[PDB]
């Protein structure tokens, strides 16, 4: 007789259509609830009491405008547990108070933990090095910095991103108007890692596809590859000459190439997360002090930097009353910043 | 609008500034201007750059 | 004498070029913020 | 432009310290047998 632990291990690690593992016990329920909570809220649940918005298919929103919205600002950073002191076990009230926001965010966080544990668990069983798990630390750093740390630095969960297509767009535009987030060099490194990653994805796929060896008679060339073949399916030597002559440099080491493909977009996302930790605290790259000194003293001095600040000032004044309803802002028409005519 | 480093910009604020709205889509090579001074005022470098770049 | 844990260190030419590009580019990016 | 006075030294060390680190390592790699 072997022990119960070992017997459970066998059963968890059976080769099946959907691998389970010990990681599966955390992953599956948290992932399923995050996803089901989003589908439930966007289909049926309002944001009238937290934001004064309609947010579900039931109320008439479409796939672009539905969301599970954050709780009201007066909730602070309450966990907002179903059985907690705000909802007191009342499911209907819980929904109305934004309890599904924290439900989705916390189950989503535990689910991401479970997914990366899955990546380690499978890598170990199959006998590979766990670089895929390591790469997944980027999406984690992003989710944690943006959905958790950022609102924890601010007044409340209200200012986290709400889970929806249009809601996220709103989160972008808020970040431009309030934080001048485009000016932030940690964001800029994120952009370079994402666009550089997409560049590498396209250029590498295209290069292999255009330096293939003729290994078949088909004009459709996909069949002329066998997974167990020992030989390279495309010519590294020819690819290298091409890029050396076109661009001036080229990869010559395939291991370096593939490592660099991990490095670029993972590093970029990590840089962007560091910037958002700063924004949690309003510690922005908002201004260039020297620009401000000059512009204040010299009314003929103008740059694209000073122009963008005028846009931000417009965004804040025009959006804040409806976007921040707990502030009870009333901005008389006469105080609103506007240029001529418009 | 000041775009260049020597006229008060840094790397993040600097730019080559697009050609004047008074020009519109009119072709504004160097030889259409009465002088380099005019050409610079009206954003001639932008058109020379972008047309040679898109062709290249 | 003789510590057997010693190992030579290396940095190939390509790595030098990559590292210098990283440094210079970071400097070109961050310098505006340092001057402020 | 009234820039920060430490901006120059900060930028200069930011470039030079790691760059020289790399140069040191490169040259002593070439001089190996």
């Amino acid at each position: 007789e072997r022990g119960w632990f070992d017997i459970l291990d066998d059963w968890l690690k059976r080769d099946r259509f959907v691998f389970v593992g010990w990681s599966g016990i955390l992953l599956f329920p948290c992932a399923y609830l995050a996803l089901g909570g989003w589908l439930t809220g966007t289909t049926f649940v309002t944001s009238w009491y937290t934001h004064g918005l309609a947010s579900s298919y039931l109320e008439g929103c479409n796939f672009l405008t539905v969301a599970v919205s954050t709780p009201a600002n007066s909730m602070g950073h309450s966990l907002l547990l179903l059985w907690g002191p705000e909802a007191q076990g009342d499911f209907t009230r819980w929904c109305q108070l934004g309890g599904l926001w924290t439900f989705i965010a916390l189950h989503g966080a535990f689910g991401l933990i479970g997914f990366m544990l899955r990546q380690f668990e499978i890598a170990r069983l199959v006998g590979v090095r766990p670089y895929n798990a390591i790469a997944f630390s980027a999406p984690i750093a992003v989710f944690v910095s943006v959905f958790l740390i950022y609102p924890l630095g601010q007044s409340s969960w209200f200012f986290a991103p709400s889970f929806g297509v249009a809601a996220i767009f709103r989160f972008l535009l808020f970040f431009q108007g309030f934080h001048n987030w485009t000016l932030n060099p940690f964001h800029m490194m994120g952009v370079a890692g994402v666009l550089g990653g997409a560049l590498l994805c396209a250029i590498h796929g295209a290069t292999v596809e255009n330096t293939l060896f003729q290994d078949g008679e088909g004009a459709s060339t996909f069949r002329a590859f066998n997974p167990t073949q020992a030989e390279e399916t495309y010519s590294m030597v020819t690819a290298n000459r091409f890029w050396s002559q076109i661009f001036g440099i080229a990869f010559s080491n395939k291991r370096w190439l593939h490592f660099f493909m991990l490095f670029v977009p993972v590093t970029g996302l990590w840089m962007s997360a560091i910037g958002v930790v700063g924004l949690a605290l309003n510690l922005r790259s908002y201004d260039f002090i020297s620009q401000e000194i000059r512009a204040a003293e010299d009314p003929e001095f103008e740059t694209f930097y000073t122009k963008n600040l005028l846009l931000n000032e417009g965004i804040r004044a025009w959006m804040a009353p409806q976007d921040q309803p707990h502030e009870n802002f009333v901005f008389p028409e006469e105080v609103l910043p506007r240029g001529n005519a418009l | 609008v000041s775009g260049s480093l020597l006229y008060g910009n840094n790397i993040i604020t600097g730019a080559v500034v697009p050609s004047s709205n008074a020009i519109g889509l009119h072709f504004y090579p160097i030889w259409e201007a009465a002088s380099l001074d005019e050409w610079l005022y009206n954003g001639g470098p932008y058109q020379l750059i972008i047309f040679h770049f898109l062709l290249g | 004498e003789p510590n057997p844990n010693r190992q030579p260190v290396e940095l190939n030419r390509t790595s030098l070029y990559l590292g210098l590009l990283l440094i210079l580019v970071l400097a070109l990016l961050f310098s505006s913020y340092f001057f402020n | 432009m009234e820039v920060n006075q430490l901006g120059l030294i900060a930028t200069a060390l930011f470039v030079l310290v790691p760059s020289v680190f790399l140069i040191i390592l490169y040259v002593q790699t070439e001089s190996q047998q």
Binding site: S244, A250 | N10 | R13, T14, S32 | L8
Partner: peptide, 30 residues
């Protein structure tokens, strides 16, 4: 000072491009 600094870094990057291209480690097939 700032303009000289930004131009100097740029010029170094352009020089690095020249060495990385024409004084590269040659790819060796053997």
């Amino acid at each position: 000072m700032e303009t000289i600094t930004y131009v100097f870094i740029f010029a170094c990057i352009i020089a690095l491009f020249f060495f990385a291209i024409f004084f590269r480690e040659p790819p060796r097939i053997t």
